[PDB]
């Protein structure tokens, strides 16, 4: 029953915390070239000096969804949140469009956002990566 998102800070760090981009030469260290972030961005710099509202905005919709699921569990039972989560997971897992980033129509219907617009909708948004094969590897887990 949370309104404002809570527990947004990291509690542990490591040099292999990002499994997607790890060096093949030294598997315990991240791959700076394939990160494509400017090459001078250590992970430690991401732990300080953030805008206070950024974490609230990034996790807002997930928090509202979790509160709705908790209310359904309290009032309806386990089956209702189970079914909602199953529907959403099936819809999300069957969609794979490497050339587009827009959400599906059915996802919007399930989220009850058929006729709703937020700034995420208006503003949806290299040398290495950003290709179809990287998305294939990330999606399949290989």
């Amino acid at each position: 029953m949370n309104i404002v998102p809570q527990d947004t800070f990291k509690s542990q760090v490591s040099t292999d915390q990002d499994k997607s981009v790890l060096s093949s030469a030294v598997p315990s260290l991240p791959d700076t070239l394939r990160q494509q972030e400017g090459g001078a961005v250590p992970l430690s710099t991401q732990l300080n000096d953030r805008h206070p509202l950024e974490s609230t905005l990034k996790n807002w919709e997930t928090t509202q969804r979790q509160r709705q699921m908790e209310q359904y569990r309290q009032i309806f039972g386990i089956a209702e949140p189970m079914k909602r989560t199953m529907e959403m997971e099936i819809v999300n897992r069957t969609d794979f469009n490497p050339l587009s980033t827009n959400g599906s129509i059915h996802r919007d219907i399930l989220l009850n956002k058929e006729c709703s617009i937020d700034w995420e909708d208006v503003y949806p948004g290299t040398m290495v990566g950003d290709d179809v094969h990287s998305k294939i590897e990330k999606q399949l887990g290989i």
């Binding site: 309806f76 529907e87 099936i90 819809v91 069957t94 219907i109 009850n112």
Partner: protein, 241 residues
């Protein structure tokens, strides 16, 4: 029947049809009961048939009429598990609409929402449609008395009056003849009791052989509340002509 696929999932056949949707449609007549919905001047009446062949059953626990919100009632044709699933989802939809937009959910908007969910089920491969037919009745603050029906294919539409069941054709023909005679798309009565009696009379003359107070279920929607009648109320309505 389906040759290869189309026996499990909802994809097109060579004829351009969705066999799983049609089979879900055929699944709606398993209960072999009928329901009727009519509009009054300021009320909407739904009457459903009760069949309790088993003598060990508790009759008071058998019902296909559900209360969705303060103003909306629903009648389901089909097996009771999918009926209860649909009822719970409709309750959640109405409550969320009220929370999100600041006013009560209208009957037609809820019908459209359920139909959109049904469209999801008809297009996704790993989802099956619910083999039920839903009928929502209310007295909308803008549109007056309202009856809207939704089916497994995702199609929804509003009705002056409607009937659904294995014997829906006879009731539909009788209603059409009556509305031809009266030239009015509703019932000209000032109380919902007269409308209930008229619906009971229509059901009796359409199905035949009549019934007692325990073979019927009646729900009535007014401008303020939707409520289901009890056995004594139905007995009074049967006695009163």
């Amino acid at each position: 029947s389906a040759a290869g696929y189309d026996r499990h999932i909802t994809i097109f056949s060579p004829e351009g049809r969705l066999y799983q949707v049609e089979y879900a449609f055929k699944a709606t007549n398993q209960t072999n009961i009928n329901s009727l919905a009519v509009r009054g001047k300021d009320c909407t009446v739904v009457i459903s048939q009760k069949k309790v062949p088993d003598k060990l059953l508790d009759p008071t626990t058998v019902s296909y009429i559900f209360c969705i919100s303060r103003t909306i009632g629903m009648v389901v044709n089909g097996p009771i598990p999918d009926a209860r699933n649909a009822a719970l989802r409709a309750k959640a939809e109405a409550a969320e609409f009220r929370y999100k937009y600041g006013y009560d959910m209208p009957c037609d908007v809820l019908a459209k929402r359920m139909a959109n969910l049904s469209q999801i089920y008809t297009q996704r491969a790993y989802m099956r449609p619910l083999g039920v037919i839903l009928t929502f009745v209310s007295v909308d603050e803008e549109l007056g008395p309202s009856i809207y029906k939704t089916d497994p294919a995702g199609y929804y539409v509003g009705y002056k009056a409607t009937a659904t069941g294995p014997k829906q054709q006879e009731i539909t023909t009788n209603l059409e003849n009556h509305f031809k005679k009266s030239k009015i798309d509703h019932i000209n009565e000032e109380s919902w009791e007269k409308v209930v009696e008229f619906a009971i009379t229509h059901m009796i003359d359409a199905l035949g052989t009549e019934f007692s107070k325990n073979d019927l279920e009646v729900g009535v929607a007014t401008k303020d509340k939707f409520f289901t009648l009890s056995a004594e109320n139905i007995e009074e309505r049967l006695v009163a002509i």
